[PDB]
């Protein structure tokens, strides 16, 4: 009941805050009393509480000065507590700001602070700041100390002293220290880090009572520039702990022997200021993977770090947030128990994450009212937070582009009106996105695709089979345990190319709210050719951590074909590095883990039999070419976004177009739109020709013909319709299906006595 | 005018990376900019820094940054950053790591309020350590590529302004005949031409005489033929670098092929001329197309013509080049081609002899026991599936053998539209004939359309021959 | 227990002709070398399982390394009954269902089929 949302106050007084009267009564607060307000970063202040009926019950109204004192902004939640112990200040030490005092002659205390505090009884707390108006000028002042040493009410008898050095504005600006609100896209990882760190440091008594050892080592791996360094500072500043940052490059740049001294001094000081937090930024430079151990200094520093981590103790109240790009790049010795046990994945932010990052970076800029950040977030895929900030900067630069023609470069001074008139526009963001480049495109994206069964056309048999094999063991696993039999840990999709296998996998993933991971055979093939086969184990690991998950191995037959499969690439079979590693990881999967794996192949006769053995990937399901209703569904899905002429109903065309794959459907629509598109541009060109004939002829309000996609252009498109799959390929597929089926005899001949 | 950025509340970039071909003029641009803005310019050469004794290089670098920050606004040019921070292929020694990490930490520690900009320089972005290209250190990248015909013309006019050129000098001809020539090569060409003029002027001037007549000295002046001789003797430095320009080939040079003309204009011209209305309806446009037809029928001409009609950049990549680079274990060149095609959007990436790689593996004829996929092909598929839908990077594949192309490449989403290019017909053959004889005079008795009429079944190459 | 002893031979080819010739390679040759080097007095018995006997390299079948060959037939009536009850041993079954009756007539079906 004592927590309220910050809101703008009617009164601009620095030492006065407004609260809703009933809310004050609930807290037993009276008008004019001194109240202690706690904000962010464990920073609190003292203000005079006044009743304001216009202020909402769950809201607290206060001005910019108190907002700065509490380190909070609009919309933040702050706590108000009774402070009847505020004693009248015997002496208060307050000093001004360096820039605000230039041009003022005499004692700044007498000019501003003496009348500002005389008979005003304004409460003041150590480190508080405020703005005082006097002599046509406003001068900032910072409270250095108070007689009680916590806070006091400056009375007329209070001796206010302003003898000291001026306060620097640039250094003062650091008071807007980072909090949880200044980061985004890491909500879940943010919760994990906040828990694992803030809990022991702020409330170690819980762990002591439960008699557990809170972790010391935390490892934050992810993509560069994702915001790793900001999370640690936010956490440390919110817990009020002493944060000491170490950068790997900085340590490695020091002379031999000096790096160890700096590291030991860091650990020693951090332990002194417990609770403390240590961030080994870019630990890869300090302790890179042992691919080659060249020299003696590198080994000395890595071993020094190891022994320092081991020697640290739980009672020391110290936490070491490492940082890197990929966990494998770190030396394994650091990941042993005791040094670095917990690992967190600060992965690429999702659509919502991109939205929050954009809103965070663009809050301080002069955005236009037509800015549509949701569109930018939707169109930004593979963009890390830093890339989003770069995009915003590029958009502002493009706005400047548009604003250069008026502003003369040779003039040292520029009109203020033009400066105030500048503001980015959505089109500027579009241009910046067009010019910018993503930094993360080959990283496995783990998210819940939006594809639903409605987008899946018919296939009731396959729908049922896959729902059976996957949906249940992730939706009702407890009863699977009740009966206890092992569930199927795999399945293989064989069917014609371009029939929507990935769509089926994503739809089944979405139905179960399970993460989907898309891995294509070419990527694993490249990594093996790159001698980075550990990437396969990395894929399996990631799929495991993000359980429940659906690991989709796209073009499983690509690797076998590279070796040969069944066509005879090499003299023999298909097994190789990547395939054998895949089998090894498959047999090593945990039965209790909800990591279902799906394999898609356009050629089932070439797949190595060892992969089809039970226990790895045994369920085989046939995906037929779309039938009448399936083809209707694909047609409407492809034209769902586009308008069609009323004369054209696509179900009629779907009815008779048997034997044509979904890809052919997509291309028929593409070509139909394309021909209607030529029609549209031809009409536009004829209009331009007519206008050239009669440029002065005022354009009457003639209703423009509705540019639709008509049936004639569908005819023209189907004139170039294709069917990639022949009846011979389907004959091969059904031959495989028959070799699989082999079901007869006891369909109805069995019955008990 | 930092006040503009401050009012808009944006952070102006600190790191600028100018990559390109050697001698293209990188060092001059930075000095020109700094001198025009009146800023204090301090130049650092990678060789100079690396030549200093251990510990002294770091001192010089820190002194450079410190002085530059003192004299704000300031500009720092790390000429040939490759020596300072070369790509981590092998990290040998401790000094190299010390200097690279010192540069990293110095770049990170610099602040926007410091009014400092660091123009790097190199030959290819991949040659630089990736750690430098992270956000905060070196974010913007600029491609100082080979100058175009007009660029060569301005470079020649700049270098030859101080020399005594003749009144008959035709620099436009030299620019037209200079392809793959960087600016430095053009200056060398000018010097060679002057040297050849001296050649012609040696016979009169006695070498043993310490003094030479002033009249002969004032009479010296280069002539167009001297430039021709120098060009004949000179050598280009850039020939294997992907040239990105707008070819002048037009539909008129394309003979007939109305059906294919329409199809390709549909598939390419519209999504780059009227993409806003494509978005209006919103359906995904085709991101590829494959040309199968007889050899020597003008496929590259068609691609260049469609590129010109859209004012879109054309990039010619032949299968042998990618094949050599893979054999050279530089397969990152493929990603580089895709990247370049992306930056210069709108673009038409033309993969010439797509079937060359498949044949090297075998394709359908059975080179190896199996299919055609390999390093380069698989990387091409991976980059294809990873392309941005909103980006106007259309890709065209040309193959003289369609029955050998790997089916995985023909899957929808990478390169699916297949268009047949027939042998030239009567009017097409007439067009090719006139184009080949367009430059040459013909006897009045000979009209080439009559011959073109009856010469069915003969390719454009046969016409040329 | 060397599971899928024929996997290595198939990787080299075994009898189907993976490569132009036989199946021996690094791992196989090392296995033979260790086999011939085993101590007679040591109680280290070794069992090899293969789903394809016609592809196994003959050198591995030579006496002294792995010579006893035993055929494992498909489960018969009582064997199938045993597999059925083992698979349903943990689960409750309706009183109407006795699994031995089904096991009796389901000849030619492997234990994996029973499990499924």
From Swiss-Prot, chain A:
CDD domains reported for this sequence: RecA-like_CDC48_r1-like, RecA-like_CDC48_r2-like
- Indicate where this protein resides in the cell: Nucleus; Cytoplasm, Cytoskeleton, Phragmoplast; Cell membrane
Which of UniProt's keywords are assigned here?
Acetylation, ATP-binding, Cell cycle, Cell division, Cell membrane, Cytoplasm, Cytoskeleton, Membrane, Nucleotide-binding, Nucleus, Phosphoprotein, Protein transport, Repeat, Transport
Would you say which domain of life the source belongs to? Eukaryota
Instruction: Summarize the impact of residue 501 to A.
Output: Abolishes ATPase activity
An annotated GO cellular component: phragmoplast
Annotated ATP binding lies at 495-503
Provide the residue positions that the database annotates as binding ADP.
184, 222-230, 361
The principal location of this protein is nucleus
For this UniProt entry, the molecular function terms from Gene Ontology, in alphabetical order, are: ATP binding; ATP hydrolysis activity; identical protein binding
Checking InterPro entries in the record gives: AAA+_ATPase (IPR003593), AAA_ATPase_CDC48 (IPR005938), AAA_ATPase_domain (IPR050168), AAA_lid_3 (IPR041569), Asp_de-COase-like_dom_sf (IPR009010), ATPase_AAA_core (IPR003959), ATPase_AAA_CS (IPR003960), Cdc48_dom2 (IPR004201)
Q: Which GO terms describe its biological process?
A: cell division; negative regulation of defense response; pollen germination; pollen tube growth; protein destabilization; protein transport
PTM per UniProt? Phosphorylated on at least one threonine residue and on Ser-15 by SERK1.
Identify residues that carry Phosphoserine.
15
Q: Does the keyword Nucleotide-binding apply?
A: yes
Q: How does it sit in the membrane?
A: Peripheral membrane protein
State how it assembles: Homohexamer. Interacts with SERK1, GRF6, KAPP and SYP31, but not with KNOLLE. Component of the SERK1 signaling complex, composed of KAPP, CDC48A, GRF6 or GRF7, SERK1, SERK2, SERK3/BAK1 and BRI1. Interacts with PUX1, PUX2, PUX3, PUX4, PUX5, PUX7 and PUX11 via its N-terminus.
Q: What does this protein's UniProt record list under function?
A: Probably functions in cell division and growth processes. Interacts with certain SNAREs as part of specialized membrane fusion events where vesicles from the same organelle fuse (homotypic fusion).
Family to which this protein belongs: Belongs to the AAA ATPase family.
Q: What is this protein called?
A: Cell division control protein 48 homolog A
Organism the protein comes from: Arabidopsis thaliana
> Gene name, please?
CDC48A
